[PDB]
C-alpha cells in the first residue's frame, strides 16, 4: 500500500505516467536510500513507462546508493526486450559496479543465453574471468551444457595455437 508507488507497479502503466507528469517537477524524488524511479522501474518490467523516462533525461550510467547499475538489474530482471534497448543506449557494459560484476556474470547467474550473446556480441569477452575466474564458462561448465561452451570456445579459445612472441625472441 505504498500509495502511488504501490499503485504504480499495479500494472496501471497509466497511473505511473499520471504522477510522472509533475507540472512542478518534484515528485521525481527517489527514496531515502536514494533509489531512483528509473531504478525501481528498471526491475518492474514496464518497458513503456521507463522507456519514456530515459528519454526525459535520466542517464543509464547511474549508480544506486548500494552501487548497482541498471545494466545489472536489467539483466537481473529477465526482460530480453528492455535489455536490448537498455544496453544499446550507451553500452555501459564496460562499466562494472564496485565488485566488478559484469552484466554477463548476472545474465548467466539467472539463465539468459540470448541476452548473454548480445552482451559479448560487443567484445565483453565471455572469458573475462571475474575475481576468481567466476565467469559463465564455469557456471556453464557445471550443468555440463557443452552447447554454449563450444559456441563460446569456437569464438577463439579451444583451438588456441601455442602463444609466443614473448619468451624466445630476445633475452
Amino acid at each position: 500500500m505504498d500509495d502511488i508507488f504501490t499503485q504504480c507497479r499495479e500494472g496501471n502503466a497509466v497511473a505511473v505516467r499520471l504522477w510522472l507528469d509533475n507540472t512542478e517537477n518534484d515528485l521525481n524524488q527517489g527514496d531515502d536510500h536514494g533509489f531512483s524511479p528509473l531504478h525501481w522501474a528498471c526491475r518492474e518490467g514496464r518497458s513503456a513507462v521507463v522507456e519514456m523516462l530515459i528519454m526525459r533525461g535520466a542517464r543509464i550510467n547511474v549508480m544506486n546508493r548500494g552501487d548497482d547499475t541498471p545494466l545489472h538489474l536489467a539483466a537481473s530482471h529477465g526482460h530480453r526486450d528492455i535489455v536490448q534497448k537498455l544496453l544499446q543506449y550507451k553500452a555501459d557494459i564496460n562499466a562494472v559496479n564496485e565488485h566488478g560484476n559484469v552484466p554477463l556474470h548476472y545474465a548467466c547467474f539467472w539463465g539468459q543465453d540470448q541476452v548473454a550473446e548480445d552482451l559479448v556480441a560487443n567484445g565483453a569477452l565471455v572469458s573475462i574471468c571475474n575475481k576468481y575466474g567466476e565467469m559463465p564458462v564455469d557456471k556453464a561448465k557445471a550443468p555440463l551444457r557443452e552447447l554454449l561452451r563450444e559456441r563460446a570456445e569456437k569464438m577463439g579459445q579451444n583451438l588456441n595455437r601455442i602463444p609466443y612472441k614473448d619468451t624466445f625472441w630476445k633475452g
Binding site: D32, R43, S76, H99, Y132, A142, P143
Partner: protein, 70 residues
C-alpha cells in the same frame, strides 16, 4: 545394469543431489550449499546463513543495506 539413482534437485542449479549429501532446504525448496550464494557476495555464504529479498538473495547484512539506510 544401468543405475543413476538421482533424486531431488537444486532449486537454483537444478542439480540432483542425494540428499543427505549436500543439499540445503530453506523454507521448503532445496539448494546446494552451492546455491547458497550471496548475489553480491554470491560467493558461497560462510556458515551457510543466507537471506532472500526481492528475487535476489543477500546475506542479511547486505539485504538490510538495500532494504534500509546504513
Amino acid at each position: 545394469m544401468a543405475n543413476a539413482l538421482a533424486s531431488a534437485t537444486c532449486e537454483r542449479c537444478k542439480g540432483g543431489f542425494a540428499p543427505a549429501e549436500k543439499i540445503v532446504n530453506s523454507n521448503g525448496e532445496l539448494y546446494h550449499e552451492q546455491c547458497f550464494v550471496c548475489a553480491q557476495c554470491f560467493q558461497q555464504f560462510p556458515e551457510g546463513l543466507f537471506y532472500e529479498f526481492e528475487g535476489r538473495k543477500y546475506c542479511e547484512h547486505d539485504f538490510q543495506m538495500l532494504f534500509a539506510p546504513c
